[PDB]
Enzyme design. Structure first.
Site: not given
Ligand SMILES: *C(=N)CNC(=O)CNC(=O)[C@H](Cc1ccccc1)NC(=O)[C@@H](NS(C)(=O)=O)c1cccc(Cl)c1
Ligand SMILES: [Zn+2]
Lengths: 202, 11
Positions: A53, A70, A114
């Site tokens: 999130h 948030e 949201q």
């Molecule tokens: C909100 N209501 C919905 N929540 C989110 O959008 C949270 N999204 C993420 O945590 C994304 C998920 C994702 C992963 C891959 C492709 C599209 C979406 N996570 C990330 O982007 C992840 N990096 S990655 C896996 O893309 O290299 C990430 C980045 C920074 C911190 C963290 Cl903890 C994870």
């Protein structure tokens, strides 16, 4: 939801580039920014997790204010319970690194914008950070950007009466991004799908 | 936009 790469591009389009530190996981240390506006997008979860999130943190040295945006507007207790997220160290380090008296104001949102099934948290973050980069003394409310959406008390998150409002927040957010972000424009269909109001229900 | 709360924190 949104990837880091997507949020990075969107923030850049919205003019936040000079202040924006990056996207990080829950381990974001805090601000070392005694003489400059700064902001970041922070995951409630560690990177090892894939990510859960998104929230936005922002720092205004003039008023010594650390903003926490948030999108559900959870209480600190609820942030720990629901997402296992705590930010006490990040505040401590920010204060000690960036405030001449080691005192700050924490201003945090207390309402949701949201819907409960929405995966738009990342995008609501970008919108808040547009507000902060243009109106750093008043990014939560009473500014041209945040005036477009409406907070509902966090206790009503799951009430059916606020759902059309929480949906309309989402449409305003997408309208906002259409007009402000070349990246969102050219990925409109994909992002809308990945973040849709109902997403956790597919 | 959103209601917010302001807490003074000293370290
Ligand atoms: C909100 N209501 C919905 N929540 C989110 O959008 C949270 N999204 C993420 O945590 C994304 C998920 C994702 C992963 C891959 C492709 C599209 C979406 N996570 C990330 O982007 C992840 N990096 S990655 C896996 O893309 O290299 C990430 C980045 C920074 C911190 C963290 Cl903890 C994870
Ligand atoms: Zn649906």
């Amino acid at each position: 939801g949104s990837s880091e790469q997507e949020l990075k591009a969107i923030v850049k389009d919205l003019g936040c580039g000079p202040y924006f530190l990056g996207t990080y996981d829950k381990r974001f240390p805090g601000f070392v920014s005694p003489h400059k506006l700064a902001c970041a997008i922070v995951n409630t979860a560690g990177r090892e997790t894939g990510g859960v999130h998104w929230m936005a943190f922002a720092w205004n040295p003039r008023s010594k204010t650390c903003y926490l945006f948030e999108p559900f507007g959870f209480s600190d207790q609820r942030l720990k319970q629901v997402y296992q997220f705590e930010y006490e160290s990040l505040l401590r380090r920010s204060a000690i690194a960036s405030s001449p008296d080691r005192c700050i104001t924490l201003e945090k949102s207390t309402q949701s914008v949201q819907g409960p099934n929405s995966a738009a948290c990342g995008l609501f973050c970008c919108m808040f950070l547009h507000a902060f980069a243009n109106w750093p003394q008043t990014p939560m409310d009473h500014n041209p950007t945040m005036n477009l959406i409406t907070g509902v008390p966090n206790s009503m998150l799951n009430s059916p009466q606020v759902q059309p409002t929480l949906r309309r927040n989402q449409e305003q957010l997408y309208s906002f991004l259409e007009r402000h972000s070349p990246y969102f424009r050219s990925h409109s269909a994909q992002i809308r799908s990945a973040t849709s109001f109902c997403h956790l229900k597919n | 936009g959103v209601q917010s709360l302001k807490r003074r924190r000293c370290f």
